[PDB]
Amino acid sequence: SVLNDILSRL
């Protein structure tokens, strides 16, 4: 499965 915790850069 793909990553679930999406992190926003900058």
Partner 1 sequence: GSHSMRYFYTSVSRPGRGEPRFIAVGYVDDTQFVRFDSDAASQRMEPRAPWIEQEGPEYWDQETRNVKAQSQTDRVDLGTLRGYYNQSEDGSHTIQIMYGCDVGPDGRFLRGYRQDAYDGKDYIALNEDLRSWTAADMAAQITKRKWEAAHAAEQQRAYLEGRCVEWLRRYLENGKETLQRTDPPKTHMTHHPISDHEATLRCWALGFYPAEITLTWQRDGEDQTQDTELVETRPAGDGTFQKWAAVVVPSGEEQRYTCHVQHEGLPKPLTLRWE
Amino acid at 5: D
By rule CB under 8 A, what count of residues binds partner 1? 10
CB of 3 to partner 1, least distance (A): 5
CB of 8 to partner 1, least distance (A): 5
The token duo for 10 is 């900058």
Chain centroid to Cα 7, Å, comes to 4
CB of 7 to partner 1, least distance (A): 5
Residue 9 has phi, psi (to 5 degrees) of -90, 145
Q: Could you give the string, one character per residue 1-10, with x where binding to partner 1 holds by CB under 8 A and - elsewhere?
A: xxxxxxxxxx
